[PDB]
Amino acid sequence: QFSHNPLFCIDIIKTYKPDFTPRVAFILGSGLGALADQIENAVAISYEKLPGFPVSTVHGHAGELVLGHLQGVPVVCMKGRGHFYEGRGMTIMTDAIRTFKLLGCELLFCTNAAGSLRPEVGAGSLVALKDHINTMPGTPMVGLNDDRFGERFFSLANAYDAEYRALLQKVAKEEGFPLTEGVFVSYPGPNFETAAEIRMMQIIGGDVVGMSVVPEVISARHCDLKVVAVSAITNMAEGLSDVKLSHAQTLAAAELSKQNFINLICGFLRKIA
Amino acid sequence: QFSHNPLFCIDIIKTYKPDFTPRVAFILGSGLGALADQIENAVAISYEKLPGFPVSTVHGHAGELVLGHLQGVPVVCMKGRGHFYEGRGMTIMTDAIRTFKLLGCELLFCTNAAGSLRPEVGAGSLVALKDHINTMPGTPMVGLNDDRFGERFFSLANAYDAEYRALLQKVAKEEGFPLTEGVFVSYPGPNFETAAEIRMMQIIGGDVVGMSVVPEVISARHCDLKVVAVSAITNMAEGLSDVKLSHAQTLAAAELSKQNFINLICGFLRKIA
Amino acid sequence: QFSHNPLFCIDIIKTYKPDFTPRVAFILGSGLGALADQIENAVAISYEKLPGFPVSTVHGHAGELVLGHLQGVPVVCMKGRGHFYEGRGMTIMTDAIRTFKLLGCELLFCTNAAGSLRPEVGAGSLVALKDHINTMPGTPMVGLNDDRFGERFFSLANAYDAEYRALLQKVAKEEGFPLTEGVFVSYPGPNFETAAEIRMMQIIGGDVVGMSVVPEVISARHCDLKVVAVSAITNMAEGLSDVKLSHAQTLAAAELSKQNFINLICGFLRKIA
Amino acid sequence: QFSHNPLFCIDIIKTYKPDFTPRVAFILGSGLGALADQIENAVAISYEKLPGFPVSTVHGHAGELVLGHLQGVPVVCMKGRGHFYEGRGMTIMTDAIRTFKLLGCELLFCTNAAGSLRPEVGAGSLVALKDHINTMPGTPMVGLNDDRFGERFFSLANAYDAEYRALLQKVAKEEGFPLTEGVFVSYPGPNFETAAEIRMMQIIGGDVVGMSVVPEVISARHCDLKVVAVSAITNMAEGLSDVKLSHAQTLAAAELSKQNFINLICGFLRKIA
Amino acid sequence: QFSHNPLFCIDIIKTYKPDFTPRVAFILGSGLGALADQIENAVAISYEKLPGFPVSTVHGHAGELVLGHLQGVPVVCMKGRGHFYEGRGMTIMTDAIRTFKLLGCELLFCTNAAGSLRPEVGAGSLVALKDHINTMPGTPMVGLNDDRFGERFFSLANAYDAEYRALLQKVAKEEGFPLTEGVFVSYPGPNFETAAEIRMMQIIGGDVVGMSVVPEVISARHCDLKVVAVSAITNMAEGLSDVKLSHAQTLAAAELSKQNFINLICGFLRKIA
Amino acid sequence: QFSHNPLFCIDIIKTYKPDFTPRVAFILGSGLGALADQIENAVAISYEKLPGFPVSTVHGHAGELVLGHLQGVPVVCMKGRGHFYEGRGMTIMTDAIRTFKLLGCELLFCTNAAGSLRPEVGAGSLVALKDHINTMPGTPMVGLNDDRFGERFFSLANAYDAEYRALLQKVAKEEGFPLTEGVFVSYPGPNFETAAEIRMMQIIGGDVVGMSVVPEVISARHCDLKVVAVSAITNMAEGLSDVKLSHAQTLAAAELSKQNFINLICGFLRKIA
Ligand SMILES: O=c1[nH]c(=O)c2nc[nH]c2[nH]1
Ligand SMILES: O=c1[nH]c(=O)c2nc[nH]c2[nH]1
Ligand SMILES: O=c1[nH]c(=O)c2nc[nH]c2[nH]1
Ligand SMILES: O=c1[nH]c(=O)c2nc[nH]c2[nH]1
Ligand SMILES: O=c1[nH]c(=O)c2nc[nH]c2[nH]1
Ligand SMILES: O=c1[nH]c(=O)c2nc[nH]c2[nH]1
Structure with a gap:
């Protein structure tokens, strides 16, 4: 018995955004959604109307799916994501990514607020992730495989x-x-x-630490959806500075890099258009 | 739907220990309970009478909660803890810690028998833990957050x-x-x-390895309960010596440091009194 | 409530292979079963007839249990194993191993296709594993302990x-x-x-990476069944070469070492006979 | 946590049947769907596309929802229903009925093949049910009430x-x-x-016996949707004749009254138009 | 694994009502709690504080347990009950009744608003039930038996x-x-x-119909707690009159017999005192 | 996913009773097993060894399956049955009956201790049941149908x-x-x-009341296994006499008819031989 949410959504979306095929799908984490405000002819669908989508429970995540144009590029933007820590397993973002895939998207631009593991890179910096190290227990595709979207085994080579x-x-x-x-x-x-643990992450060879990304990306690769990810650093990892960590600190510190982020994105989109 | 055990307990305890507000809460692991025998006006409540508490299934853990005085300090002492390996998830010690918090405790003195990862420190030594590295899958607060006890996100900075x-x-x-x-x-x-794996723990930067602590401590920090932990080394980690590992070895080797432990605790209590 | 499959199987097997007591139990992973074809007076029981056994869902794994003789040695051979990624937990191979134990086996010869973490050892090489590092979430015995097969706690010293x-x-x-x-x-x-992640495995101190072994082995040690494992390298781990990873690559590359493997096994058996 | 399928469907249906508001909703049981073939501008949606709908597992039930016009009356017709005996509880038809309600339907015309408990009425007869006696265990609304659709308690007075x-x-x-x-x-x-049992049903005061109707109707009344039901007798109840009972007998014997049924319906519709 | 709520409650109650042993336990249904207002030295414990108790979700049921004296008789009074239709099974009232038993109660005085099946007895009448006919699916003790409270099989002879x-x-x-x-x-x-269905209940031999009583009573008999029940008729059963049925009608019509009820109870208590 | 226990058992039984095909299958309820003592070349298999069988929890039911000969007739005899009241659903006896069917049995001789609903028939009488009225909630085949054993719908005509x-x-x-x-x-x-309730059973048209039979019989008919049932009356139903009901009374009163029962069975067997 496999989930059919991705399919339902496709029909549900057609009712709100007819004759629309997006090229880039976006995931806007905490306080990063200020981008979705510049979407042309933007249509907003609440996650409550999209079966499988991560109905929010966290601050900085609304619970909407915005569809429209950006730099003359058809785009499906996710304001708010779903995390492992919510207690629903590594599969929390899958149906969502699987929806992007069906919608026709050709790439996933994954954004997220993170902490830096390099003293060199500080708060307010942007980092283009080039690979990842999963520390969460298990992976998204563990379980019966859904032949419809991907294969039993898949390579994460060149994931990003x-x-x-x-x-x-x-x-x-x-x-x-x-x-x-x-x-x-x-x-x-x-x-x-x-x-x-942070020192341990440095030893293991990490540069950025966060509580997301991984679930989405691995799901994306499984159904063969090209990935691109950029983290917005909001502080140094625990123990590399004197700053105290809080979600309030995260949301606030994501405003220093917000402008560069929008320029980076709107710039990327213009080159791919 | 959130557990209400902590609240039940508070009432249940009032029936056995009326007009009593403990300052320090203790967790006595394997063969470390010999301390609870010196509690003044000690009252003992079986875990079977306290909803949420870890009804024992392991040796060196009785299943009682002792309340009384030590060095003229009101104290709630847990003879026996709950582990992850019991198969009930990282939340096995939470309601318990949450009870300590409601009881009014101002600090958690967590004890546990462990193995050493440093050849310098051998069997019979005591170690004051200063931080930890979780290797168990997941964490205690993963899931819906209980606003009553803590926030969605919390810092483990200065946990110990x-x-x-x-x-x-x-x-x-x-x-x-x-x-x-x-x-x-x-x-x-x-x-x-x-x-x-032990070598891997040395590389990751660890000094002591054990099968507990983490669950309790993280739960404690979540509901804002100061923590203090001391491990009683009972042998070198696997592969750093010629000694064979067994639970019998653990219980036995926790007798070499038992006296120093009691003195350390009874001494600590006297300074905080 | 503990599983009784191991016991059922013993009776079920007696119906197909009466008055037979195997000494060595074998687990043949992907495309390694070409060995079971040389078993004398071989009797084959489908996993569908053996409660608890891993009814296959993966390529290179049939779903049969072959009993007979090899080098004049009574042998129980498992054509196809069960994995964690199947979504049934770390206990997927346990009842199976527990069956070997009851059958009377004196040793488990575990084989599996893996990737190399050392540039020195390449595709087609055989590696005798001497220890392991679990990265899967949790362990097989987590949960209530089955006194019938083993103890609550057990040492993995000299597992291999x-x-x-x-x-x-x-x-x-x-x-x-x-x-x-x-x-x-x-x-x-x-x-x-x-x-x-592969680099991280190198740093952690690993030489070979695979998606199995661990479950079986730890279960084996728990019920006190001596273990022996040999991996058949089918490629370098991700990122140590230019080769693309696929299950097709795995099955194919396990043919270069197939002959040496059979000779190694048939040789080992002859010395123990 | 309440099901949101009814809502999803409304959107899903809008994609296939835009700007359409049905007045009568129909449920076509076994071999009664020959009616849905005369629907004007008929659009067919498979239950597989409608979350909550009874994906068929029984003969005489397709798994489609047909929308169109009949006697110039907007109509939503269910080819195939869901039963209790399928093992999903008395709630199996609820989300479906709740969908009719949201769609705007003003009445439910429930049809079903049944057995007669009166020797006077034989195979091929049509019966307009005027009340019912539930013998299935429990009722559809047992459980938390969904304020959205109805009240905790509701009267079945004048249900039909x-x-x-x-x-x-x-x-x-x-x-x-x-x-x-x-x-x-x-x-x-x-x-x-x-x-x-049939004699017992006669004693209890019954005239027709079947394995459905009840679930749907009670759900209908709960969300305040007027009901109308007609059973197509396909044989005498067990023990009132010499005829053997089979599903094959049911499907076949529903052809004697098929014409009268269509005339009765198409006639009813014309008077209400 | 058996519920231990009854035991917990006993301790929890001792904290609010120390050195108190009730003789009669009462269950006050809808709008019948006006009695609990005349309890001497009444102490009120919310069901939220009593594990196992039916935390209300229905009107006319508060969610409190009142302990005190009535006619100089120690009494434990339940303001509000739990029903089957709540979706928690026939066991919904058990732990509660089992608590009464442990508390020391010698009898259960069960009250409830019902409908009359006899035209002779109308709204506002009181009926002392002398036996019952269960129509709910299953029974409270179905499942593993709790030797602590009763036996596997028990007689309902002289239940009332x-x-x-x-x-x-x-x-x-x-x-x-x-x-x-x-x-x-x-x-x-x-x-x-x-x-x-009502006619069917008349034929089956019933005099009063309601949605409760049964669960409580059977539970009571199982743990050997004498029972007494009185229904307050609030209307004729469906179809025996012209009156419309609603919960509003029930609550309102329970005021005609309220005075006689209190006199009947306060009178009964005085004779047993 | 369908149970495969029936199949397992067939193999498990072959190990204990090789080359044996029974004709009549028997179910011996409470204190009726004294018959299984006269089985020729009797082999006994504990239910603990037969997956799916009702491991006993009730007195008068051992937990064994005896195979042998009676009146020169191959026979499979069930000492002890499974009931609904055990809390495992109406399917508790199914796999068992399904095993009889596979074993090759041509008929099920179902026995059980019951109460009489006719004053004419008293304690110690034997009654050959000719039909039944199910009062338990639901039926054994409710749920997905197992094409292997029977059809979705089946007639209970001439069940006995x-x-x-x-x-x-x-x-x-x-x-x-x-x-x-x-x-x-x-x-x-x-x-x-x-x-x-008993009077209600008389009105409904019943002659004997018991807590079993139904589950087994309906399962038997589903997989097309002819049925024969005989109840051993152990008392009048509740309220038709002055005798108190207890399980102790049941076991004891089943000794008056024990001899006639054995003669009836051993006689039946002789005529069918
Ligand atoms: O796992 C995380 N750790 C951090 O320190 C952090 N800061 C922002 N986001 C973060 N995520
Ligand atoms: O995880 C653990 N490993 C050990 O070696 C040990 N010794 C005591 N306690 C221990 N816990
Ligand atoms: O986890 C694994 N990683 C690999 O690269 C590989 N190759 C074969 N088998 C493998 N297993
Ligand atoms: O419950 C039922 N009993 C019958 O005899 C019958 N015939 C058709 N449909 C039927 N349903
Ligand atoms: O089941 C019930 N039926 C009724 O008609 C009624 N009136 C009050 N309480 C009632 N309960
Ligand atoms: O349901 C039952 N009721 C009885 O009275 C009885 N006596 C024996 N067996 C019985 N079963």
Whole structure:
């Protein structure tokens, strides 16, 4: 018995956004949705109307799916995501990603607020993730495989499309701001990491730590949906500074890089258009 | 739907220990309960009478909650804890810690028998943990958050109160025995670690390995209950010696440090009184 | 309430293979079953007839249990195993191993196709595992303990019998092919590892990475069944080469070492006979 | 947590049948769907596309929802229903009925093949049910009440609208065929009734026995949706004749009254138009 | 695994009502709690504080347990009950009754608003039930038996104590009002009965119909707690009159007999004192 | 997903009773197993060894399956049955009956201790049931149908084979004792019926009341296994006498008819041999 939500959604969306085929799908984490406000002919569907979507329970995540145009590019934007720490398993974002795939999207632009594991990169920086290290228990596709979307086994090689990443770099040069690339390691949460664990993440070879990304991305790769991810650093990981960690700190510190983020995105979109 | 056990307990305890407000809550692991025998006006409530408490299934853990005085300090002492390996999830110790919090406790003194990851520290030593590395799958607060006790997100910074740890040090000098501080990393169990995994724990940066602590502590921090933890080393981790590992070895080797432990605790209590 | 499948099987097997007591139990992973074809007076029982056994859902795994003789040695051979990624928990192979134990087996010869974490060892090589690092969430015995088969706590010291491993070495010299020994680290799957994660496995101290072994082995040790494992390398781990990873690549690349494997096994059996 | 399927469907249907508001909703049981073939501008939606709908598992039930016009009357017709004996509880038809309600329907015309408990009425007869006796265990609304659709408690007085029943009578006179009215008693099934039980149904005061109706009707009344039901007798109840009972007998014997049924319906519709 | 709520409650109650042993336990249904207002030295415990108790969801049921004295008789009074139609099974009232038993109660005085099945007895009448006919699916003790409270099998002979019923009669003569005795048959609800079903209840031999009583009483008999029940008729069953059925009608019509009820109870208590 | 226990058992039984095909299957209720003691070459298999069988929890039911010969007739005899009141649903006896069917049995001889609903028939009498009235909630086949054993819908006409019943009559004449035939109505239990309910059973048209039979028989008919049932009356139903009901009374009163029962059975077997 496999979920059929992705299919339902496709029909439900057609009722609100008829004759529309998006190219890029976006996931806007905490306080990053200020982008969805600039979508042309934007139509908003609440997750409550889309079976399978992550009905929000966290701040900085609304619970809407915005469809429209950005830089003359058809786009499906997710204001708010779903996390592992919500207690619904690594599959929380899957049907959602699977919807993007059916909608016709050709790429997933995954954004998220994170912490830095490199003293060199501080709060307010943007990082284009180039690979990840899962620390959450298990993976999204564990269980019976849904032949409809993907295969039993799949490679995560070049998960974070190297080619699209290259365009991200150009866009960054052009806009006068650094775009460092790093390995993202996922933490289950909902509590923050311990200083001890952060050092362990540094030793393991990580550059950025967050509580999401992984679920979505692995699901995306499984159904063969190209991925691109950019984290908005909001502080140094626990123990690398003197700053106290709070969700309030996260939401606030995501405003320093907000402008560069929108330029990076709107720039990327313009080159791919 | 959130558990209400903590609340039930508070009433249940009032029937056995009326007009009593404890300051320090204790968790006595395997063969460490010999301390609860010196509690003044000690009242004992079986876990079977306290909804949510870890009804024992392991040796060295009775299943009682002792309330009374120690060094003229009101105290609630847990003879026996609950583990992940019992198969009930990372939430096994939560309602319990949450009870301590409601009872009015101002600090959790968590004890546990562990293995050493440093050849320098051997069997019979006591270690004041200063941080930890979770290796168990997931965390205690994963799932809907209980606004009543804590917030969705919380910092583990200074989880093992640095100030209380300092007092622990004085007490140790005063009693003529070393109190080394180390990072505790948790293992799921119930099988012991592999030599290979132990080396991995050394590389990750750990000093002590055990099958508990983490669940309790993270729950404690969530509901804002200061923590203090001391492990009683009972052997070197797998592969760092010639000694064979067994639960029988654990219970037995926890008798070498038993006296120093009681002195350390009874000393700590006297300074905080 | 404990599973009784192991017991049922013993009776069910007696109906197909009467008055037969195997000494060595074998687990043949993907495309490794070509060995079971040389079993003398071979009797085949489908897993569908054996309660608890892993009814296959993966390629390279049939779903049969072959009983007979090999080098004049009574043998119970499992064509096809069960994995964590199937979504049934770390206990998926337990009843099976527990059956071997009851059958009277004196040792488990576990085989499996894996990836190499050492550039020195490449595709087509055989590796005798000498220990492992679990990365899957949790362990097989987590939960109530079945006193019938083992104890609550058990040591994984010398899990991969060092003495049997020594015989494996002789057999390898004698047959003119290398038999390197390494630490096997398990990955949950079903997706393959990320380059980033592989490096992390190298740092953690691993030599071979695969999606099985661990479950079986830990279960084996719990009920006190000596273990021996040999992985057939089918490629370098993700990111250590230019080769693309697929299940098709795995099945195909397990044919280069197939002959040496059979000779190693048939040789081992002859020395223990 | 209440089901939201009814809502989803409304959107899903809008995609296939835009700007359409049905007045009468129909439920076509076994071999009664031959009516849905005469629907003007008929649009067909498979239950597989409508969350909550009874995806068929029984013969004589397709799994489609047909929308269109009949006698110039907007109509939503259910080809195939869901039963208790399927093992999903008395709530199996609820979301479906609740969908009719939201769609805007003003009445439910429930049809079903049944057995007669009166020797006077035989195979091929049509019966307009005037009340029912539930024999299935429990009722559809047992559980938390969904304030959205109805109240905690509701009256089943005049469940089978007496006024609409009167029109049914006229239509019957006009078409030259009897339309006897009777009490329908529900049996759980899936096995047929015992002669003994049938006599018990006669004693209890029943006129027609079937394995459905009840669930739908009670759900209908709860969300305040007027009901009308007509059973197509396909044989005498067990023990009142010499005929053997089978599903094959049911499907076949529903062809004797098929023409009168269509005339009765198409006639009813014309008077209400 | 058996529920331990009854035991917890006993301790929880001791905290609010110390050194108190009730003789009669009362269950006050809809709008019948006006009695609990005359309890001497009344102490009120919310069901939210008593594990196992039916936290209300229905009107006319508060969610409190009142303990005190009535006619100088120690009494434990339940303001509000739990029903089957709530969706929690026939066991919904058990732990509650089991609590009464442990508390030391010697009898259960069960009250409830019902419908009359006899035209002779109308709205406002009181009926002392003398036996019952269960129509709800299953029974409270179905499942593993709790040796602590009762036996696997138990007789319902003289369930409604014939001797106590006799005292009820005297009290009724003495107060100048009739107290007819009748058989109570239970209906699952939450919808009201159909006229058809009511006739069926008359044929089956019932005198009063309601949606409760049965669960409580059978539970009581199981743990050997003498029972006494009195229904307050609030209308004729469906189809025996012209009155419309609603919960509003029930609550309102329970005020005509309210005074006689209190006199009957307060009178009964005085004779047993 | 359908149960495969029946199949497992067939193999498990072959190990204990090789080359044996039974003709009659027997179900011995409470204190009726004294028959299984006269089975020739009797082999006994504990239910603990037969997956799906009702591991006993009730007195008068051992938990064994005896296979052998009786009157030179191959026979599979069930010492002890499973009931609804055990809390495992109406399917509790199914796999068992389904095993009889596969074993090759040509008929089920169902016995059980019951109560009489006719004053004419008293304690110690034997009754050949000729039909039944189910009062338990639901039926055994409710749910997905197992095409392997039966069809979705099946007739209960002549459930209690009329022809075999005729032989039962002869055997009874021949042995000088009455064999009255009656309709058996099932009660859920585990509590006994109320006087009120018994009268209701008389009105409904029943002659014997018990807590079993129904589940087994309906399952038998579904997989097309001819049925024969005989109840051993152990008392009058509640309220038709002065005798108190207890399980102790049941076991004891089943000794008056024990001899006639064995003669009736051993006689029946001889005529069918
Ligand atoms: O896992 C995380 N750790 C952090 O420190 C952080 N900061 C923002 N977002 C974060 N996520
Ligand atoms: O996880 C653990 N590993 C050990 O080696 C040990 N010794 C005591 N307690 C221990 N816990
Ligand atoms: O986890 C795994 N990773 C790999 O790269 C591989 N190759 C074969 N088998 C494998 N298992
Ligand atoms: O419950 C039922 N009993 C019958 O005899 C019958 N015939 C058709 N449909 C039927 N349903
Ligand atoms: O089942 C019930 N039916 C009724 O008609 C009624 N009136 C009050 N209470 C009632 N309960
Ligand atoms: O349901 C039952 N009721 C009885 O009175 C009885 N006596 C024996 N067996 C019985 N079963």
